[PDB]
Structures are given as C-alpha cells and as structure tokens.
C-alpha cells in the first residue's frame, strides 16, 4: 500500500458519506471478493443525510482483506468508542481504505469536528489541499493551499491538518484559515 493519507478536508470533499458509528463486531472476510466487512452501529450522519433522511440504515463498511492492497485494519482502545468514518460508495456498498479518514470522534480536535459538521464543505467547490511530501515543493495555483505539514513526522497532528481549512479568501485565491 503506497497511498498517501488525505487532509481531513479532502477526505470530506471526496467522500459520499461521512458518519459517526461504533464498530460492533469482529470483521468477516468475504471469500469470493476478498473484501473484509465490518459491522457498525451508526449514530449520526453528517454527509449524505440530506439524500437519505432518517431512513439511513448503513450497517456495514467494506475494505480489502490484504494490507498490501490498502485494507483498513481497525485499532481502537475503547471497543465501545464512536468513530468518524468518511467513505466512498462503490457498487452499492460503503468502502474505506487505510487512506480513508477514520478516527475516534473523541480524538478529533474541536476544529476538525467543526470541519466535518459545518465548514469543510465551504472549500469543496474551489479550493484544493495540494501535497508537499518532499523538499522542492511548489504552489502552482491561487486556488491551492500547500500542505507543508506533510514534511512533519506526525503530519496528521500538524497545525494545518488539525486546526485549519483551505477556504476562499478573495476572488481566485484560497488560503489556510482558522476553523476556531
């Protein structure tokens, strides 16, 4: 697996569904697809809600069964804990990979919780979080925020990842702005 974890805002923008849920059993491997399936109890829906209403089932999430092909392998302290899951719909099922934003709700900063519930949506239209994985890294557009935190050891806990969003500032220009 060589996928690069996305910024929380990109995770939000690219996902079909964003929910909170408990993981409520051990995963079962499907022998035919070699997809692993996890049962969850959903508690809230923050994206997709408008399209599904209160009729929202969502009981299973799917992921490759091998680590080599980017499978999500669940690792929680509290077996009872709620997780933000940001997932894609494929062939009718909700899918995650190891590069999905999946994390204990209680582990998110207040800024990130605001992002997932209110604000990230503001940026999906115009702005893009652009990667900066190695030294010579370039900003190539006014509509881009450069994710320089990607150079840090723990980049998901970086200032940009954890407290900022890439939003319109002026016509044709996006900037990292404080969520709080």
User: In angstroms, rounded to a whole number, what is the distance separating the alpha carbons of residues 11 and 86?
Assistant: 6
Q: Give Cα separations from 116 to 2, 37, 170 (angstroms).
A: 26, 24, 23
CB 22 within 8 A of CB 8: no
Architecture label for domain 1-107: Beta Barrel (2.40)
101-105 CB contacts, 8 Å cutoff, 24+ apart? 101/5, 101/6, 101/8, 101/11, 101/12, 101/15, 102/72, 104/76, 104/78, 105/20, 105/81
| 89 token code pair | 């719909």
Of 32, 40, 77, the closest CA to residue 60 belongs to 40
User: In angstroms, rounded to a whole number, what is the distance separating the alpha carbons of residues 16 and 173?
Assistant: 26
CB 15 within 8 A of CB 47: yes
**Residues annotated in a binding site for Zn(2+):** 1
| 23 token code pair | 């993981």
Per-domain residue ranges of the chain: 1-107, 109-180
Strands (E), the chain: 17-23, 28-29, 35-47, 60-64, 82-90, 93-95, 102-104, 128-131, 144-147, 164-170, 173-178
User: In angstroms, rounded to a whole number, what is the distance separating the alpha carbons of residues 102 and 30?
Assistant: 22
Query: Which positions ≥6 away from 36 have C-beta within 8 Å?
Result: 27, 28, 29, 30, 62, 63, 64, 65, 71, 72
User: In angstroms, rounded to a whole number, what is the distance separating the alpha carbons of residues 96 and 43?
Assistant: 18
CATH number for the domain running over 109-180: 3.90.370.10
User: In angstroms, rounded to a whole number, what is the distance separating the alpha carbons of residues 157 and 108?
Assistant: 10
**Residues annotated in a binding site:** 1
Cα-Cα-Cα-Cα torsion 89, 94, 97, 99, nearest 10 degrees, comes to 60
DSSP H helices in the chain: 8-14, 49-52, 110-114, 121-124, 159-163
């Amino acid at each position: 697996c060589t996928c690069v974890p996305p910024h929380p805002q990109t995770a939000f923008c690219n996902s079909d569904l964003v929910i909170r849920a408990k993981f409520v059993g051990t995963p079962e491997v499907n022998q035919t697809t070699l997809y692993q399936r996890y049962e969850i109890k959903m508690t809230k829906m923050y994206k997709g809600f408008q399209a599904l209403g209160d009729a929202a089932d969502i009981r299973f999430v799917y992921t490759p069964a091998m680590e080599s092909v980017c499978g999500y392998f669940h690792r929680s302290h509290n077996r009872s804990e709620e997780f933000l899951i940001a997932g894609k719909l494929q062939d009718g099922l909700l899918h995650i990979t190891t590069c999905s934003f999946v994390a204990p709700w209680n582990s998110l900063s207040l800024a990130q919780r605001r992002g997932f519930t209110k604000t990230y949506t503001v940026g999906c239209e115009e702005c893009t979080v652009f990667p900066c994985l190695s030294i010579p890294c370039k900003l190539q557009s006014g509509t881009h925020c450069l994710w320089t935190d990607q150079l840090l050891q723990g980049s998901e806990k970086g200032f940009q990842s954890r407290h900022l969003a890439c939003l319109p500032r002026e016509p044709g220009l996006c900037t990292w702005q404080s969520l709080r």
